[model samples]
Target chain A: VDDDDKMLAAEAANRDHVTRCVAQTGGSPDLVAHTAALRLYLRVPHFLTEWTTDPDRRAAVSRALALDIVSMKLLDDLMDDDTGLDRVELACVCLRLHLRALHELESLARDPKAVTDILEQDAVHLCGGQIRTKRSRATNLREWRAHASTYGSTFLGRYGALAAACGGEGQPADSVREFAEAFAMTITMADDLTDYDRNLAHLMRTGAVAGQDVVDLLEELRGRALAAVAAPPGAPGLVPVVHLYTDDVLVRLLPRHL
Target chain B: DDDDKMLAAEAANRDHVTRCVAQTGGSPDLVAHTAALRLYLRVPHFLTEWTTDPDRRAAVSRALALDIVSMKLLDDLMDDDTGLDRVELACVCLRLHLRALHELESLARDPKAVTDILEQDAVHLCGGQIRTKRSRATNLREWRAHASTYGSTFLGRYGALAAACGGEGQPADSVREFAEAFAMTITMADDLTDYDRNGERDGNLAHLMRTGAVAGQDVVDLLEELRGRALAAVAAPPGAPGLVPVVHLYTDDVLVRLLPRHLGEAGAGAMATVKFKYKGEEKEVDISKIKKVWRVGKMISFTYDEGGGKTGRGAVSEKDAPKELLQMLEKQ
Candidate 1:
């Protein structure tokens, strides 16, 4: 399949999965249209277009991560926005999405527990991190750094779990797990620095974003993310993923030396 | 209430917890808490037709009980302000949660399905619970709407996992529906028992009373209706399971013993007048006039007209405050 077809197939499965998911929650169109999770996944650049064992696995993994990430995002809204949404009502939609994500992972892994447990463990994990700094007025950088560590675990475990499901295990799984954390940190750090200038100023009173703190962390995370695949016995599955991140996502932050 | 099946199961279940606890050489405090979980102990009762293998039945029961309790702990952890003790609690909590999946996974028809149940409760059910605490519903309609999620709160996974393991007997949806009904019953019972905590707390019993739901709907009947749903779903095909008797025991435990006094614990002296017989004399009692109700030994004692009137006093016992009588006093 061409990139368009790959993208189409991935999204159609997402639409099918999401259509069923919303139907379970009294069917909110707002939910059906909340395709941000899949759209984000598709936009991230395809990893397996190089050819793999089963093409459907790619769609399933995309759907699985889509469901998992979206569920956590619901909690993010609830925690970050104390004014709240109808989220208390749409909460069931969060529940439905996570369960379907597991079922998607269920179809992919041999020991589905290995992959599914990643989702469960991470949910418990983020409940600790996500809510810890609900408003982010922590007294110090310890709390800020801790909050960032927790915040980024979302994409870390999820992206890691996706690879583990699609044959990224043993040492490869361990490295992917380590590598994904940095990539996720990269996303969280990069994603936030542009969006919330006030919050960043608040965060950087000690852990400066422009000061060596964030720039250093971002560089370390990026280099670390790249090293996992760029090294001998690199995670081949992640090469295109990192390639996209480096070539496209990092272009702005990268030096003139390149 | 006819099931010695449940009676025998509870007896064995208590011992099973004992043996397991002994094997673990677990702490002294853990012993009593595990013992009190009679409902989980009887998990095997639901699976009578599903698995007759005593070993597998015992394992599934343990698996499910642990699953529910694991969530129960993590939920407290979620609500608790972060503390080292809470950190310790979380350590113990996730251990139970992680073990619960591995245990249940071994017995599940689709092991993958087992993990799904745990994760569902972790997110979906926890959402209901945390949201329930935060979003206090203003009226009965909103409160009742939230009640549907309580299934996800407790039995969401309990029912689904039971259905997963009970693959040999596919009352699949029936098992889940029954679990949901029972959870609703639990909500109603808690609504009554915890009404004081919910006083402004217009979610559970608070709304039940504010909307005057306790009057005409007579939460007794409404609770019983949920109980009826629980039983009917489980006993469908016109069959019966010991879950019926255990529920009866539960009803007696709460409804008969502890439920009604909450009318007084509804304790705002909050209600309209209802007729009552005192020393063979029927009297006009104004609930709004009552100041305090307390129980000491043989009698429940309260004095009414605390705003300083004819200072009437009364002492009653368990039977005096049945639902119909409270229903009368509650109707404005």
Candidate 2:
């Protein structure tokens, strides 16, 4: 199909899915979970278009989305004198997650259990008030800048580091499992919260959107993340590393039993 | 009353979740919000029980109808299968949820704040559940080995429920606390179920046992905990009022019965029994013999007649009712 036809089909399918999802809630569920699921679902297709196997198509969609009229407009809003601060806030969060993933690799080698414990803690994760500052505040700034230089602006770079850190290659599997997991959770939640207001405004203006798609995709990705950690012929020290990570974090960081 | 409403609302919200599943490209906020609303409106028993509380009832009803239309601008990000699968699974999850909720209904009533939180208990995780599903593909056995793994969604959901109950001071907090105390039961239950899978070592539980995450006796302990908690949850105070209908239909008019004993456990005596006592003028609570068959995708079919009906849906031959009688029944 041509771009126009494919795009239209994609759009229609998206709408059909959202409408049905909202309807199925059959006018039940608390507002928070419903909306969170809705936002997650809505984000999936956008991300999927860029993540699919066809690299050319994915690149095309990514380019379009990054530069698309409405999306750019929304990004432009981020530049506003008032909104810029919020964008910066998000950028900071995004950077912090990157640094943590990187830092864990070194920590994994020397003290994997400690790394896992830190990852599993609720006091650190839930509030978003704290960032692991194992370094001087001055060093932390440099760390953030370093991550942005190397991995910012792309999804692959974000998780690729974890994959590498977790013994994907070169490095020992000392901390990759836990690191990859913490890395994934940080990215997913970051994507959701950062885009929340923009997505809401878009939905209000356009009269269509559901969020469960994003929720499911993230769930699927978490599965992928786990698979990566569990793949056979795992990296040196990888299996134990991943088991520690999962045993520590999957039960802790992930939303279960809902 | 509010908790009861919340349960039904969650069940009905399955449709919203299904709809969310049906559509594509939803944001996290929309899913969370819609789920919150649906839980308020669709939990079957919760709504009926809370009928007297106009503030709770009216407020929830309005939220559900109002928000759905405004939330579909981004429905292009997901695959059709993505939505379909999540909703179908969600239906299963919510049904499991109700079984537990019914067990804790009365305890929920003791504290007003607890009711309020249950109202807001819309943000669900089910992360472990998704992990399990994801593992079902190639890692089936390895994954199943961790069936009642500590992090599975079954435990998580109940843990959340327990917190919702306790944090809110709902009298049921004590009861709901079992979510934590009796964690990992479902994982255990699934392990038992998988043990019966066609191949040995192929089931996840078997694989896990071989790998040493657990022992054979650990499986036994897990099942005991699961059955014990589930029974307590169901048989707990407010007394399975919501559950009675489903099982009653299953055992009575449906013409088939669940395994007389829990599927994985041994001995008929160890199984649970639902006793009905007649109060006035001796009456007989008679049960019928029936047949059952299984279908794919977790569907089951049971066939039976009212016992007295001469005409039943069937394939018949001459000499039975002269063939004319069968033909008349068919025509009707």
Candidate 3:
């Protein structure tokens, strides 16, 4: 087999690496929220970006708010200043919220035209509720720009599971599913690192897992994403996504980090 | 009947909060008002339900109606419980409804133009994900438009009522005086307790007191100022009898309670928080006494508390809380 394909073989072996590693390190780790977020970002963005026209997919976007991530993430962030364990736990919550927000962004992108007015309306009305002080406005805009800069590019890269991120253009419908799954795995890693200190501090201060335990959280998160991809294919293109996902996420789980 | 409507509305609102609490797996006490509000709303409903029995319902509706008025005062306080500036919050919330009410009245007269503004929000309530000035300005502008609509509604309604009484619309002097007094009355209520401007505790109130924005003298000044406005509204050329009760509600009840507090002690701050006491029917101690005040995880319970009650306790994930406290606070 070719080496890249062999890489898939390697990934499969390492698929459970994070769980085993975490257990050895005395960390209780789970990645339900983490993987879900990654999966969400991957699956939802194209629909959000207007690449997908399927109305059912759009409906799914609205339903996803049922998974309220903002409050979850804020709660996660609160403990980030504390201990490591809490940090690790919240690191997962942060991952989940970011994923949700990212997917929401994607959902909007899927039906960009439909949401444009609401988006603008939200910007002016909800986000800008009058503050007694003017300085708060400046602070909000700064935070928004800062977040956009850091996380925006990650979406493009992970979704190279989309051709658009890979330099191909237009609605390449067949590859959209692949883009979404891989994008999720990508965020799993990013979330762990960025939120490491915060998560760990939270856990340390409050006897909870910290949001910062990135390396481990992503490993578990990616594993779940791979599993979801492995589920019986519902569509023709879904088959390839499953295979590609297995190779992408599992390789690092083996005895060696690779 | 109006009491029933109000009760039903508040019930729906409280149920929404209840479900929200369960969904978030939040400590109900952290959102105490959100929970208690529904219970309070049901008091009227509960009393009214007993009307079939007659033994219970007698005079209960009137008593509950008065209680509803009392609760409105508290509801307004809770709305700004984050302790932000009360006047600003009042300005924002009232602007939207007032505008809508005005537009509704305007439509009564024009029978047109109302449709265009009906579903539209003339006052923008958002400040981009953060509550800020642009949104605030949108509210102010909309409120001003609403005020004009309210002024017009008063004028139209008065005319209609006057016609019913075999008279022309209220005199210009009466309408103008009525509107001015109504607006000023709300301003006077602002002098009574409002929200804390910043720093979660009623620190904003302290800040206001320090800045002299809310002072004893100002409170004294407002009482006299409100009295003059109240009289002007009463003497208007074409006075509204219905409005008289509302003016009475504000002057007799809300103003008396609100004005002194606004100018009295500084609003709840750190020290304010210490004295604030967790208000519950059965308990009134520190927020720490509330279960939700502690813990982490969807189930695990964890959030940070500042220690020695200095900064005051905050959310501590279950894993992080002292084992003894965690065990004590557990759902057992």
Candidate 4:
């Protein structure tokens, strides 16, 4: 499909997934719409466009992506504003719904247990990140990086589970998982760079990152992300995704060639 | 044989808890921790009484055991101003407990059927916990609303477990109602103590009474009424056979000390008569007679009945009303 057509299909699939999720969980459609709009603003749909080609896995991955986007949005709002009891309530429901969908999707694999183990590990990291953000006032540079890594692990596990569902378990799954983790971390570093001025001020007080050039950090992450996808014995199916992340996302975040 | 029945039930509960603790790859502390919970919650016996299926009872008991531990860790994280490290550790523990609870679905007779029943309670339990941490109750209505949300989550969690184990009919509903009442009472009691310590309270009946959301010792009376309802719910025919003693344990262990203290403290705030000036006539109306008060544009009205078989409706300009009286009316 053409680029515009693929984007359109991804958007449609995302909306359809959101509708199904809200219907199943009895969540508010308005909340879902607001969440989708926010994620769209962040260009999450662009990142999720890779799943559209796999007709068999499209619906499952779409639902998983929808759940993840909304869950993260709710979680971010709660941390940003210390209120939103309703948001927290909905997020808890979203948490279960996300896990439930992942379980069902992963159950389609040859060894469902391996997929579930990854999911459980991802949950630990996601939940750990959540608790860390909520509880800690003073986070050092290492702690901040660790927090980002946990979130990265979640995306890694999710995409890895998707690959497993597409008969990419064992060696293929491992490569996909590694690629996702590296790529997600690169995205996180890009985000950190973009948010540097704001986070830098806060981090200075907390001593999170006192004297590091963020451009240098970003460059290193870019190298790792590119290397993971370029490394042969990678999931062949993830070639386009690698291009999208490295070329479109990571490289764009750096200084443009004169 | 009677003693042996009790012993057998208790033994089964301990065995279930031990198995669950082992599943976590926990050490001796966790086994003893589960045992302690089995003793305190008294739920295993209740589960045994509620169901004939041994596996269902064991699975349900294990889930409840997991829930109890998770709630404790969660309660600690929320109620106390614990450090970040402590909160993180507690959350990790809570995650494990939840995972174990999720694993119980594998042991359930119909995992899909049981999950649907349990999910409703999960929302209430998790949602209510989230809400309780953020919002502080401002009035009696808010307090009751918080209490109901906080209370029903406990009932719903345990009630789903019971329902999963072949519990049905009015007896099941009655048991759940009793649990809810017990939970509400416990929440209110905690707020009472919390007000004493932190000076910020959410579900305190005394605070609710002071705000005039309840009238003339009604909150105190309501506590007494709830206590009776809970006991009667347990005593009702076709109830879970061993559940009565558990209700008695909570009532005596927790409720008895809390209700009387708060009731006595809230006595001064109970409304008997509210006097106001309405349109030039000096009005003294019993608090009970003042059914509704509302404002329409610049005018405020009261719907009330004076004694002697007489009904009265009065309106006054908002500009002329006393500030305190307006505040009181606004609270209503």
Candidate 5:
């Protein structure tokens, strides 16, 4: 929905679509664990606004993309054992939401055949990334970059799905791809810094990058993502979301035992 | 006793897998967990006993197996000691998940409705499961609140699944109370393994016995109460005679099996008498009359409900019973 303070409106709108969809799916929004996934997905509908002007259509696209990421996060969290939800039980929701998203978005898409193909491709690419990196952690910075790049594939498909729903002429495919990767890399870095300091330790152990260098990398990618969304029109809704990656909020709660 | 039937079903399920995979697919090993297999496949097996089309039974069995096995694979992925890497595990999990639903949809009379219902139930079940894990009930009322939902999703699911496979006459609503009692009975045992996290971890019959939350006889009375509700829910459906008896048989079967186990006693066989061993001879405490149980000399002792039976030193004993009513006499 259009609003004067686009950030608050989008945040509320994003959560409304997300919370209700999860409710329809019979999942718990009361789960404090879901807040992390919500935080990541809050900016998606706003990302679509850079391309589409219609309010209701924006909500529809928002619902689809919200489900898309929420479902994936459910699976990923279960897959990595990162969730506090019941394990086998949540997987059932994960599979249900996964299929439900496709069931809706296919109906929403202007070009079902093309969008379905794109969706499948993105899934395959994302799985490829997951399988490759999960098989082994990146051994060197070169391999680490490749591993980190694959994590970005999760970010790559939103624009494609959104573009299929609305139109993507403002932000072209190349810019979207670069933007998604850069933003995802910024996420990968920040996730490292606060990931209980897991990869931060790994990077320090190896010669990949230092702590400050990780911050620098994050700032550069954050700027790149913001610029890519420029599209000659203001992407005012998305600026704060990009800033979220490099923000002090995440690192301030860094992983160290009390 | 259910465990033996479970083993047979498991053998049939795995043998079916072995023959099919040679003709048609390694992962047959994943479908080996008896508890889960029994939960998912047991309902379909019951339908076949009445009048089964061999092909339809096999299809349902395969579909249910995939669903069960997918959950297994996900569990395997979570283990720190698993031999298969998560990649292999993920591939199998996703494939099994997709195909399991696909098979069920193909078999269903109304694929969309059935799948959507199953999907919704998954969420409700998941929600219930989260509550079960996080909320340890401090009171029996709260414990009942937890027990009320546990496994109810799957209980109705199997009934719907039975209908899908052309076992249509039995509506799930008729058996809702039956299922609640059935699940309420089963989860009591699971409390042992869950330690302090589950509702009955403290509320377990043995734990309750020690805490005097409910005396041993009180536990049996509630077991009898649950059994009464379950049997009451089961009655003859018009066109099927075996169904009623079997359903009732199914109802009482669990009653005898778990009633004694929960009370820190063993079941010798199915019987009308509530199984109890109060010192001396193994006493067959009659369920026909109410009984009074209390602690004496740190040992559980009981009496017929009407008796004011008391012994020397402010304790009770069986010889004190005038009606051959059994009570434990040993005092430490």
Candidate 6:
């Protein structure tokens, strides 16, 4: 199928899959709310990546994505609540739930032991960055790097899982990782730019970045984003998705600021 | 060769902890915390205690350690402050843990082939977390539903790890049940401690008692019963012996510490009939009669059934319900 047809078809299939997931939640309002919250963020990426053409694989990806998104938002909500500490066990339970769901999905398409190792490595990178960010005292550069590195696992693990669920026969790992890493960093930088005023305020308070380096940092991130898209095509779907994301960053997100 | 494999597994476990600790690069406290967590989980103990091909031992050991540490870090993040600055760190940690988990997924033969079961348990886990956070639970019935889901999630993780060891079989179900039992037991223990400190109830057990869904003494008694259920989950099919005592040791400590102090403070039976008016009819409902109560726009719906029937439902104006009833319902 051509790219437009492929994107359109994938979108319809994912919509149906999301509908099935919501129904499976027994029509709970909270479940419905959670699904809706994540639907948009996930739907575009799933479609753009052309996750799977098969109906079964598509359904599995949708369900896995649904679980991941809900768990993420649930954690976010808990973190905001003053009584969040009181519900720690509840939060832990929710995360394990997502982990198992994702694990089960991976088992269908890859070796469970390999999947376990990949997930642990992602967790280590993720947790290591987090521990650095949370340590109460750290250099401004350390904090900035820690914050930026979060997207390494958050997006890479997520998008990589989508690719893995497709059985990874059509998609190459190196290409997928390249796109994920670049797209994640690009999005993070875009977000930082949007919240530039707020971020700079925090940075100033912490004295992490020189005022002049802020502009240089954006330029560096922009270069990385451009380079990621320029890399050789690994899968038919990789370029288009990376283009869409970078287009979003350069054209829509950064243009006004520039 | 077998001895070397065992030694390698032990070395792998130690190596992971040391490497992770060094990577954190925080302090003596951080080092101890990281090391202590690895030691406490003792995934190698499972390898040593159970009869398995030593070949799979190292991979399984690393897998279990990674999973346990990930869980520990995730739990700690939740219990601590996770505001804007902190969230990135927590997410970073969770991502790393998950990445490590993915790496180990290939090494072992997973006994549980069915994905649907794990997914179901996951749904329960997420549902339970949402309910507790929203405080949508008004009674023990709702509370127990959350508790069961939360417990099942905990057990499900352990079950997955056990499945990696080999043909875990039905005995694994009992072990899962023990994990669930342990979860609920510990939940009650934490709740009781929170109540003692603040004279305010926290978690389902406390919610049940404070709302008079179950009596304070009854809540205490229920915890003891849960303890038995936990032990029941641990009792073996002969081969897995160490697990039972391991469970008993932790559970016995919690049971002794929690039962007396809270039950004494529990005072007397607090159950009372709650009355409310909705539409043109007056309704008298026990606290336990209420189910699935939530606000729909400006009105609060109290859904209940008067035995042997389709669900009976009523809506009360935000202003109409009695003051105490309104306060209680609003919390839900």
Which numbered prediction scores highest in DockQ against the true structure? 6
User: Which digits, one per residue and each the tens of the lDDT, describe model 1 over residues A96-179?
Assistant: 565566666666676776654664555445544443445345554445556777667454645665655554234356555667
The lDDT values for all models are 0.55, 0.32, 0.34, 0.54, 0.53, 0.53
lDDT of 3 at A154: 29
Q: Per-prediction TM-score, please?
A: 0.59, 0.26, 0.32, 0.59, 0.57, 0.62
- In the range A1-258, model 3's lDDT, one tens digit per residue, is 643453343233222322232233222343333333333333433222233335354334323322322323323233223323233333323323323333343333433222222222222122123221222322232332233222232223223222222221355433443444444444443343235443222232442333234335444444544543344322233334434444443453211221
Count clashing residue pairs per candidate.
Answer: 0, 113, 100, 1, 1, 53
Q: Can you write out model 2's per-residue Cα lDDT over B88-147, one digit (the tens) per residue?
A: 222222222222222333233332322233322221221222233334523433543344
Candidate ranking under TM-score, highest first, comes to 6, 4, 1, 5, 3, 2
TM-score of 5: 0.57
lDDT of 6 by residue, B123-182 (tens): 556545655665656666666667666554654555555554543343656645565666
Residue-level lDDT of model 4, residues B114-202, one tens digit each, is: 44554445545555555555676666666677678656556555655565555344366665667677676666656666666667634
Best by TM-score: 6
Off by over 4 Å in 2: A1-258, B1-11, B21-169, B178-203, B206-224, B231-332
What are the RMSD figures for all models against the true structure?
A: 10.6, 24.2, 25.5, 13.8, 11.1, 16.5
True contacts kept of each: 0.10, 0.00, 0.01, 0.13, 0.14, 0.37
Tens-digit lDDT string for candidate 1 (B1-332): 43675567666656655444433333345556556666556654554334546566666666666655544444434444323133333333434544556666666787677756656555445445545666776555566557766542467567777668754655766777777777766666666666664354456664456555544235556567777777777677534464677557665565665555544444332355545566788676665566666666745566777354577777666466544344433442
Rank order (by DockQ, best first): 6, 5, 1, 4, 2, 3
State which candidate has the highest lDDT.
1
Instruction: Flag the better candidate by lDDT, 3 or 5.
Output: 5
lDDT of 2 at B325: 35
The TM-score of predicted model 4 comes to 0.59
Q: Report model 6's interface C-alpha RMSD after superposition on the true interface residues.
A: 5.1
